[PDB]
Design an enzyme around this catalytic site. Structure first.
Site, PDB file in Angstrom:
ATOM      1  N   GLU G  60       6.032  42.404  -6.583  1.00  0.00           N
ATOM      2  CA  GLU G  60       7.389  41.800  -6.865  1.00  0.00           C
ATOM      3  C   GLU G  60       8.473  42.396  -6.127  1.00  0.00           C
ATOM      4  O   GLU G  60       9.441  42.016  -5.683  1.00  0.00           O
ATOM      5  CB  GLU G  60       7.834  41.512  -8.381  1.00  0.00           C
ATOM      6  CG  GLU G  60       9.013  40.855  -8.624  1.00  0.00           C
ATOM      7  CD  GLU G  60       9.672  41.492  -9.494  1.00  0.00           C
ATOM      8  OE1 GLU G  60       9.865  41.391 -11.013  1.00  0.00           O
ATOM      9  OE2 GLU G  60      10.811  42.383  -9.325  1.00  0.00           O
ATOM     10  N   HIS G  61       8.228  43.887  -6.273  1.00  0.00           N
ATOM     11  CA  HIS G  61       9.349  44.632  -5.191  1.00  0.00           C
ATOM     12  C   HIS G  61       8.970  44.339  -4.050  1.00  0.00           C
ATOM     13  O   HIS G  61       9.934  44.737  -3.264  1.00  0.00           O
ATOM     14  CB  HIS G  61       8.768  46.256  -5.423  1.00  0.00           C
ATOM     15  CG  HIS G  61       9.589  46.654  -6.793  1.00  0.00           C
ATOM     16  ND1 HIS G  61      10.622  47.746  -6.523  1.00  0.00           N
ATOM     17  CD2 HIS G  61       9.414  46.693  -8.078  1.00  0.00           C
ATOM     18  CE1 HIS G  61      10.983  48.060  -7.706  1.00  0.00           C
ATOM     19  NE2 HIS G  61      10.377  47.513  -8.768  1.00  0.00           N
TER      20      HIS G  61
END
Ligand code: QNO
Ligand code: QNO
Lengths: 57, 53, 49, 105, 54, 54, 446, 423, 146, 54
Positions: G60-61
């Site tokens: 997600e980062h």
């Protein structure tokens, strides 16, 4: 496009009966938990964010 | 001035606590019966007739 | 980093009914409860007599 | 209005005078048994009143102690007797009963 | 004080034989006791309220 | 600080008969409280002495 | 004037549509000039393995940091330059990337979403930079007592299951995790029948499909097959974890008994019961007069600084309870009250209070689906979890059914004499012994 | 296939009250009475009265006791919340439609029948302490509070929270006066979401014909300038630097609104470089690490402040402020693009549209508009308005910031935070 | 600090100073509230080594004799390794600080940068104060010469 | 709040055998404390029954 406050920036305190008291205008904090190491209490002499009266099934 | 307790809820309260209140008397009697070996009562229980006659 | 926190393995004390991560403890509960309750139940009976 | 009401009025002015709190400078509201409803009403009294009522009861308990009574001149005159607590007591009860009714539904 | 005397009465009757006046007079002391504590004092007190305007 | 106010036993005694607040007001009819106690122990005392012979 | 009932039928039916792929594209058209589109994936962390852990969170980062077609930073530039908002969250069970945008911009919005969700350039430069950050995140996270306590509850409630794990993983994995590890997670999980395209706003559902087909055609089509495992049941344990730390000035406690998952019908009833207990915070107005016995007592005697009940749903389980915060000398009383309230609800819920809770639930239900985003996110999640999108009207219908008995019944089923999962942090010297909290899970009266 | 929407209906009563509504066929209702009773109407003799007021929204009224207001509302799962700004107060009640009748009543009792009983109010003073405490735990609150106190000498300088010296000291008579003073028809607006115009109107005409307070939206803030500094030790120095801008409504104030978006406001992508952010890029260039900055933009009825707000480590403070400042200074210099102002324009609008997606959001927009304008200006035209901002207009706005008397508020370890003097 | 700040003048002059300077003279005589409970023994240690040294010290004796003080000095006060000057050199600045209070009486001080101590100008100022007026000289007076 | 913690009698009992903190540590040699008590009352009980015949 009035709404002095949601015109983003000046302060807008909110008291409630059921929900929690708010404070929330515009100034950063935002692009700040990104360039990290911004602590915060964990309910130190305090309240609680997000607050409630939103659910589902 | 017991009218403070006279309303719908109060009805529902006592109602909910009825089966319990019932059972607590079922415990309460059998308990007295057995602790005093109630002559009058025990005789009817099928077994526990350790008094012949 | 409070996420390094492991909960110690307990298999060493767990009743057989509660040994598999694969399945519910919901099922074993009644029985496990029944067992320890039956134990005190009888104890009182014993104390009663 | 006439004979009938002054009759009941003087029956009271009698019983009042008879009650005897007056002789210890008290006031009917000073003699009220403190329960919850009362206790709150006392809380709700304003500074002056409160302050006055404590000096009043204090004089009385001091009297009651040394078993004296106040000079006749200073006794508390019936209906010159300010019923100071009543409005509060009334509203305090008024309030309780509401929750009480709210509690039955 | 009626309660007191009634008790002074009651004690006295208690100490006299079960004959003549003493029977019925005692039977009254009795009722009065109960009648006083159970009905006379409470009403007497409610009245005193209405007299004060309480 | 003190002694009478903190010693586990003493406190008890102190907060019951030394410092404990009381109406500057109460009359003689508040004696039979302690008089009852005297009567309890006097019964207990003579009562005990009579029992070593009874 | 248009009634509440009537108003529920007014809400337009959510249009669901399947791609020859596995992608379910859904929408709830309205009148707005603005909207929310995004992808909800059935990827979480309960899906990851002890060592994989932190993968999705690490992904997600990396998600908005460059695609194959839009490299270094232009993704932002494009999103930003059109005044759109790009966002993403991930939980134990779900991952979501969503765009908030002007309605006319639905096309590039979607194009963008696709590119992100498919052509993710996890460049070594980034993946490296990113670990330093996620490390920091964990350092900050450790200060949110609340955040900690809920992870611990999870950590012990699910002792042994994957569900026991946290979303970001332990530092160790965030530090050791490699691109191969990432790539692998993406391929294992980011596949059509596990992801939904959801939207809400001023759009005709037809458009969604057209786009869904335009930029998402090319997932599970020639894919799926073997190596797609299902979800393993998770054993709830009923334990306790007390992390004593008198340096903190207030205590966090968080108790729960195992609840049933998302789809179970007895959640509606559980939620009404919850509403009856409610929440609290010291900035609430009205103390003594709050309806909730807990809330009231709390506020009057100062038994806490804030509490709040909850019901966390997972596949075939969930945690159900409350969580509070308070002075070091109030944990007992606070527990006492909360516990006694649950039982009261199990043994003697009165008819009137249950109506308040149903009413509180409707107000919450309706109040919450206000605005494109929440709705869009309710479509997605709904599809992932319910299979359908359950119309308001139905929830009302469901809530309506519930009455006193229903509460004392469902409550008794889940709360009476069941072992709790206890999680404590802070100055917990007074947090009751576990037997004691357990003994409080039933009462001798009844 | 949703139904075609309806129109907001809007009515000015001769007495000055504005009434506006919308029948979104929503399953729920929102009613908000907006009042020009914001903090700027307090004075050196009653600071905080509007706070304790904001907080007293469920004390007893004639016709609704505390208990009932509480019990009453909760019973229908409704909510009662009052929210102040330096300019307005907004009593907003919410619930499902079948229930507006009962919330509208409470609403009215609170706004028009408050008793402010001695012992209820005494009971509440403490909450000013708890309340402010909870709010001031974000540095920004104090900073902006100080920013304002610094910038003005007048009314806008009054703080949203009650001065510490006033806690426990604001009286019920002050609350009484504050209401009669400001909660009157000409300073009131009544907004309805999910109700119908004839009802609001009737409610208004029956229940909101109150008049005998003051008249204008001001004492008229005197801008002044100056700066306030708080020694703290928060490792991060929060600072805001600012100049007097344009009043709300006015055209200039959209030039400024556009500027903020050129210089940059919030982030748009979870964890981003903020590529399209003039300030953030201008800072990183010279500063290597933890920092945030954003352009700041308040606008009131008769003034406004503009500039930027920075957060950085105690020693970069200066560098961050000085880099931030020059960037604006560089737009004042004419070095403004066009596709850039264009980009800004887009963020602004999309943002605005976005700002009212929700009800709670729309009701607030309409409510404030009512009080600021006595109009209801549709999005189409607001957008048409934002469009009219010329590139030169923006430049000029910046020119104005750069050249006008300034105001700084900052808190933290100030040892490397510049002085204004020094700016 | 509590005990000291109970005279309005303390805060006023404390604020006067904080307002007038940005430097050193602006630092307050009393510890900032945020610092209470936070000043460390190492800071005390450093503060002493830093400033309590021979070149910044003077030793005065009333009722003692010069040979003793001298001996005490030479035996006991030869300490040196702190800083050197009587300054960071205060930068004057200007500005003003205002405290909303409700004390019925408003305390205010208004002021400009004058002359350093010792210097001649600073006696012109010292003379001025006495023209404009300092304290009273007669119990309850009109202060005619003021 | 509660009941067990504030009722004048109950408190006593509660702070002596319900909540009162004890070493998680003590062993069997901490039983003769309560065993002594049992012995005191068992002596008292049988002791009493023997006395109505002795
Ligand atoms: C010489 C033996 C003393 C017998 C009893 C001890 C006295 C304590 C009982 C009380 C209790 C009490 O409340 C009051 C109040 C007022 C006056 C006396 C009194 N007592 O004696
Ligand atoms: C069944 C009658 C009980 C007899 C005595 C009651 C027990 C109370 C005495 C104590 C006191 C004390 O300090 C401890 C400490 C640890 C364990 C037991 C215990 N007691 O039992």
């Amino acid at each position: 496009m009035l709404s002095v406050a949601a015109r983003s920036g000046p302060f807008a305190p909110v008291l409630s009966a059921t929900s929690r008291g708010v404070a929330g205008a515009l100034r950063p904090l935002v692009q700040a938990a990104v360039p990290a190491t911004s602590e915060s209490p964990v309910l130190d002499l305090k309240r609680s964010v997000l607050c409630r009266e939103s659910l589902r099934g | 001035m017991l009218t403070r307790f006279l309303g719908p809820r109060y009805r529902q309260l006592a109602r909910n606590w009825v089966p319990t209140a019932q059972l607590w008397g079922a415990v309460g009697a059998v308990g007295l019966v057995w602790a005093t070996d109630w002559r009058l009562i025990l005789d009817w229980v099928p077994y526990i007739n350790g008094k012949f006659k | 980093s409070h996420t390094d926190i492991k909960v110690p393995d307990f298999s060493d004390y767990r009743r057989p009914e509660v040994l598999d991560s694969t399945k519910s403890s919901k099922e074993s509960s009644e029985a496990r409860k029944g067992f320890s309750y039956l134990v005190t139940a009888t104890t009182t009976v014993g104390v009663a007599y | 209005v006439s004979a009938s009401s002054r009759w009941l009025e003087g029956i009271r002015k009698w019983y009042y005078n008879a009650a005897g709190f007056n002789k210890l400078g008290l006031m009917r509201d000073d003699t009220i048994h403190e329960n919850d409803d009362v206790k709150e009403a006392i809380r709700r009294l304003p500074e002056n009143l409160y302050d006055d009522r404590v000096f009043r009861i204090k004089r009385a308990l001091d009297l009651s102690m040394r078993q004296q009574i106040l000079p006749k001149e200073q006794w508390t005159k019936y209906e010159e007797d300010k019923s100071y607590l009543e409005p509060y007591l009334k509203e305090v009860i008024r309030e309780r009963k509401e929750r009480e009714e709210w509690a039955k539904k | 004080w009626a309660l007191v005397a009634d008790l002074l009465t009651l004690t006295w009757i208690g100490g006299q034989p079960v004959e003549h006046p003493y029977i019925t007079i005692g039977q009254l002391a009795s009722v009065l006791y109960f009648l006083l504590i159970l009905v006379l004092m409470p009403t007497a007190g409610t009245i005193e309220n209405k007299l004060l305007k309480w | 600080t003190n002694i009478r106010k903190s010693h586990p036993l003493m406190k008890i005694v102190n907060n019951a008969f030394i410092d404990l607040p009381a109406p500057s007001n109460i009359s003689s009819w508040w004696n039979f409280g302690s008089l009852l106690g005297i009567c309890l122990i006097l019964q207990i005392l003579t009562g005990l002495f009579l029992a070593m012979h009874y | 004037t248009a009634t509440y009932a009537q108003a529920l039928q007014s809400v337009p039916e959510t249009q669901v549509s399947q791609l020859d792929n596995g992608l379910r594209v859904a929408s709830e058209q309205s009148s707005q000039p603005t909207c929310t589109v995004g992808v909800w994936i059935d990827a979480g962390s309960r899906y990851e393995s002890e060592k994989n852990n932190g993968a999705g969170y690490f992904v997600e980062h990396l998600a908005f940091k460059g695609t194959k077609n839009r490299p270094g930073n232009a993704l932002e530039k494009e999103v930003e330059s059109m005044g759109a908002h790009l966002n993403a969250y991930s939980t134990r069970e779900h991952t979501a990337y969503y765009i908030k945008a002007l309605s006319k911009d639905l096309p590039k919005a979607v194009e963008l979403l696709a590119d992100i969700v498919q052509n993710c350039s996890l460049e070594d430069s980034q993946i490296e930079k990113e670990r330093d950050v996620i490390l920091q995140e964990l350092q900050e996270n450790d200060t949110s007592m609340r955040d900690v306590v809920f992870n611990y509850l999870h950590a012990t409630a699910f002792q042994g299951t994957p569900l026991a794990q946290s979303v970001e993983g332990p530092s160790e994995n965030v530090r050791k995790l490699s691109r191969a590890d990432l790539t692998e997670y993406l391929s294992r999980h980011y596949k059509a029948p596990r992801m939904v395209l959801a939207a809400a706003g001023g759009l005709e559902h037809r458009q969604l499909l057209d786009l869904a087909q335009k930029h998402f055609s090319g997932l599970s089509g020639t894919y799926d097959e073997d190596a797609v495992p299902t979800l393993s049941p998770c054993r709830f344990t009923g334990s306790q974890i007390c992390h004593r730390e008198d340096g903190l000035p207030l205590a966090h406690v968080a108790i729960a008994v195992e609840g049933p998952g998302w789809a179970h019908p007895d959640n509606v009833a559980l939620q009404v019961a919850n509403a009856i207990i409610g929440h609290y915070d010291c900035t609430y107005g009205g103390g003594a007069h709050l309806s909730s016995p807990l809330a009231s007592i709390a506020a009057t005697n100062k038994l806490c600084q804030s509490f709040q009940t909850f019901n966390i749903c997972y596949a075939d389980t969930g945690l159900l309870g409350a969580h509070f915060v308070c002075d070091h000398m109030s944990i007992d009383d606070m527990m006492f009250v909360l516990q006694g309230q649950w039982m009261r609800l199990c043994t003697s819920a009165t008819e009137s209070e249950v109506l308040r809770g149903k009413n509180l639930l409707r107000n919450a239900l309706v109040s919450h689906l206000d605005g494109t985003t929440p709705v869009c996110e309710d479509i997605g999640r709904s599809l992932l979890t319910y299979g359908r999108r359950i119309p308001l009207a139905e929830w009302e219908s469901r809530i309506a059914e519930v009455d006193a008995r229903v509460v004392r019944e469902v409550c008794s089923k889940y709360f009476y004499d069941q072992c709790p999962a206890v999680a404590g942090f802070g100055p917990i010297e007074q947090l009751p012994d576990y037997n004691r909290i357990r003994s409080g899970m039933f009462w001798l009266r009844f | 296939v949703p139904p075609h929407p309806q129109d907001l209906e809007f009515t000015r009563l001769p007495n000055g009250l504005v009434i506006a509504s919308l029948e979104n066929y929503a399953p729920a209702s929102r009613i908000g009475l907006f009042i020009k009773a914001g903090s700027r109407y307090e004075n050196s003799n009653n600071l905080g009265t509007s706070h304790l007021l904001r907080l007293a929204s469920s004390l007893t009224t004639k016709g609704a006791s505390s208990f009932k207001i509480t019990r009453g509302i909760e019973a229908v799962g409704g909510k009662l919340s009052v929210t102040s700004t330096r300019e307005n107060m907004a009593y907003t009640v919410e619930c499902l439609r079948d229930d507006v009748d009962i919330l509208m009543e409470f609403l009215l009792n609170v706004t028009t029948a408050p008793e402010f009983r001695r012992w209820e109010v005494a009971a509440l003073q403490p909450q000013l302490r708890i309340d402010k405490a909870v709010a001031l735990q974000n540095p920004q609150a104090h900073v902006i509070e100080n920013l304002h106190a610094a910038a003005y000498r007048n009314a806008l300088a009054n703080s949203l929270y009650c001065p510490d010296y006033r806690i426990g000291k604001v009286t019920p008579v002050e609350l009484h006066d504050y209401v009669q003073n400001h909660f009157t028809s000409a300073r009131m607006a009544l907004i309805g979401l999910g109700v119908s115009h004839p009802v609001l109107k009737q409610v208004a005409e029956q229940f909101l014909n109150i008049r005998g307070g003051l008249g204008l939206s001001g004492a008229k803030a005197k801008y002044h300038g100056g700066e306030i500094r708080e020694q703290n030790g928060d490792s991060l120095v929060h600072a805001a630097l600012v100049a007097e801008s344009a009043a709300i409504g006015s055209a200039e104030a959209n030039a400024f609104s556009v500027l903020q978006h050129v210089l940059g406001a919030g982030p748009h992508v979870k964890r981003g470089s903020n590529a399209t952010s003039s300030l953030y890029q201008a800072v990183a260039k010279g500063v290597h690490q933890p920092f945030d900055v954003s352009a700041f933009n308040a606008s009131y009825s008769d003034s406004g402040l503009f500039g930027f707000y920075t957060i950085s480590q105690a020693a970069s403070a200066g560098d961050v402020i000085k880099a931030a400042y020059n960037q604006v200074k560089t737009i004042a210099q004419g070095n403004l693009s066009n596709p850039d102002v264009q980009a800004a324009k887009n963020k602004l609008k999309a943002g605005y549209l976005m700002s009212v997606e929700s009800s709670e959001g729309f009701l607030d927009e309409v409510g404030s508009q009512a009080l600021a304008a006595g109009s209801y200006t549709p999005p189409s035209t607001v957008l048409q308005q934002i469009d009219a901002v010329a590139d030169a207009d923006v430049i000029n706005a910046a020119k104005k910031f750069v050249s006008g008397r300034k105001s700084m508020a900052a808190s933290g370890n100030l040892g490397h935070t510049p002085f204004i003097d020094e700016l």
